[PDB]
Write a protein that binds this ligand. Structure first.
Ligand SMILES: N=C(N)c1ccc(NC(=O)Nc2ccc(Cl)cc2)cc1
Ligand SMILES: [Ca+2]
Length: 223
């Protein structure tokens, strides 16, 4: 996250870190046994780490559970990043409490102008690299789909939306991939892509989770 603030330990209880020997992507817990993340974060051998704040120090609220199945969206296209979303089932259910909790799926798509909370342990600089150990947060509006499409001509599909600031300065970034965009207490987006980070006229682009709710519910019902 570039230009955000330190969230505070366990203030984002649905935030997950995906670990394969190191943190490589975020995710969101959507019930005690399932995590949603970005399909471009797919790897075999994922361990899901819940209840995290400092990812390099064991602080006492963590649950580390390995994945039993990963399901990338059937129409994920890695060239266009259309349908960048995947479901991860945990080997055993997480114990849910105030510090480890799930986030609700949306019943409606959020509109442009709604302020949302994006969080993750990704890069905090638009030039150079510095990865934080504690979770960073950013409040950002969803942008109109015409300003999103003017920023990225020919690249925005109906399963994507832009959120951020067209003047740059504040944005999600590499390592934030797969993490949550929450608006009005519902999961509305998944950190997906963008050109650089926090650059002028290049806002972050996010998977539009309200288009996938029937696919998620159906897949969790049968797996
Ligand atoms: N500006 C951002 N919000 C931003 C920019 C880039 C990323 N990350 C990626 O674009 N990562 C990535 C995308 C596709 C593939 Cl195939 C591999 C990595 C995340 C957020
Ligand atoms: Ca920790």
């Amino acid at each position: 996250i570039v230009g955000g603030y330190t969230c505070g330990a366990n203030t984002v209880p649905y935030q997950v870190s995906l670990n394969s020997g190191y943190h490589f992507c975020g995710g969101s817990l959507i019930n005690s046994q399932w995590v949603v993340s970005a399909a471009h974060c797919y790897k075999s051998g994922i361990q899901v780490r819940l209840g995290e704040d400092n990812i390099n120090v064991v602080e006492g609220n963590e649950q580390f559970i390995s994945a039993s199945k990963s399901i990338v969206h059937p129409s994920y296209n890695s060239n266009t990043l259309n349908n960048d979303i995947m479901l991860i089932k945990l080997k055993s259910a997480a114990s849910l409490n105030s510090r480890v909790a799930s986030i609700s799926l949306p019943t409606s798509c959020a509109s442009a102008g709604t302020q949302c909370l994006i969080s993750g342990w990704g890069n905090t600089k638009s030039s150079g690299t510095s990865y934080p150990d504690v979770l960073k947060c950013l409040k950002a509006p969803i942008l109109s789909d015409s300003s999103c499409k003017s920023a990225y001509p020919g690249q925005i599909t109906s399963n994507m939306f832009c959120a951020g600031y067209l003047e740059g300065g504040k944005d999600s970034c590499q390592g934030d991939s797969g993490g949550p965009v929450v608006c009005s207490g519902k999961l509305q987006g998944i950190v997906s892509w963008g050109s650089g980070c926090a650059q002028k006229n290049k806002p972050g682009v996010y998977t539009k989770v309200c288009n996938y709710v029937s696919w998620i519910k159906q897949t969790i019902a049968s797996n």
